């Protein structure tokens, strides 16, 4: 009920366990708390494990089963597919660098080019929110010189989703994997 500024990543995690103690989710409250945590690189260095060729997903907390909290690491020019979020809430907070978020509408069943609804540049410490009822999105680090690090919370947890072909709107099921869990590389 009473939202306080998270002092550290650990404190944020404790607050998040409180916010997800029940069966529902106050989206605006979760977003405010995520936004209020000041990114401190020393606190999340353990999870910030990059790969040269694509972005990595690094599990931080399993939220007592109610959410997955993870850190995504985007090399220069690394980006995602256009994807949905499997009927889950999805929060994205920038911890380092910038990411471009492009929004798309759910495709009609006819094969057509997916045209962008809009785009925005998410900046350090800002927290965005998406869910399937809002639409689909692609997230990209368009920087040539700066890696980006983001903190993502999904509730309920999911490890599969759909990728959408921008040319047709065709979807394919994708299994998402973790690069690391609790700071441990999981090959």
Ligand X SMILES: N[C@@H](CSS)C(=O)O
Interface residues with ligand X (CB under 6 A) are 57, 72, 80, 90, 92, 139, 152, 176
Shortest Cβ distance from residue 23 to ligand X (Å)? 23
162 is in an annotated binding site: no
Residue 60 Cβ, how far from ligand X at the closest point, in Å?
A: 13
CB of 61 to ligand X, least distance (A): 14
Structural element, H or E, at residue 172: strand 171-175
Is 137 annotated for ligand binding? yes
42: CB partners within 8 A, 6+ apart = none
**How far is Cα of residue 138 from the mean position of the Cα atoms in its chain?**
11
Between CA 141 and CA 165 the distance in angstroms is 19
- DSSP states of 135-151 as a string? -EEEEE---SS--EEEE
Q: Are 69 and 151 spatial neighbours (Cβ–Cβ below 8 Å)?
A: yes
How much of the chain is in helix, strand and coil states, percent to nearest 5? Answer: 15, 35, 45
Which is nearer to ligand X, 57 or 171 (by Cβ)?
A: 57
With respect to ligand X, which residue has the nearer C-beta, 152 or 171? Answer: 152
Residue nearest to ligand X (CB): 139
Measured from the CB atom, is 39 or 131 closer to ligand X? 131
The response to whether 78 counts as a known ligand-binding position is no
Residues annotated in the binding site, as ranges?
83, 85, 137
Binding residues for Fe cation: 83, 85, 137
């Amino acid at each position: 009920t009473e939202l306080l500024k998270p002092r550290t990543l650990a404190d944020l995690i404790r607050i998040l366990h409180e916010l997800f103690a029940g069966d529902e989710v106050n989206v605006e409250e979760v977003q405010a708390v995520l936004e209020a945590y000041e990114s401190n690189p020393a606190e999340w260095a353990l999870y910030a494990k990059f790969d040269q060729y694509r972005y990595t997903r690094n599990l931080v907390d399993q939220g007592n089963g109610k959410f997955n909290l993870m850190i995504l690491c985007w090399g220069e020019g690394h980006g995602s597919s256009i994807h949905d979020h499997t009927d889950s809430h999805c929060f994205l907070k920038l911890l380092q660098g910038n990411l471009k978020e492009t929004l798309f509408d759910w495709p009609d069943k006819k094969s057509n080019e997916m045209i962008k609804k809009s785009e925005r540049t998410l900046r350090e410490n800002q927290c965005a929110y998406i869910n399937d009822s809002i639409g689909l999105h692609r997230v990209e680090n368009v920087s040539h010189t700066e890696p980006a690090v983001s903190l993502h919370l999904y509730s309920p947890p999911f490890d599969t989703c759909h990728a959408f072909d921008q040319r047709t709107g065709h979807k394919n099921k994708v299994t998402m994997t973790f690069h690391s869990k609790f700071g441990i590389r999981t090959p």
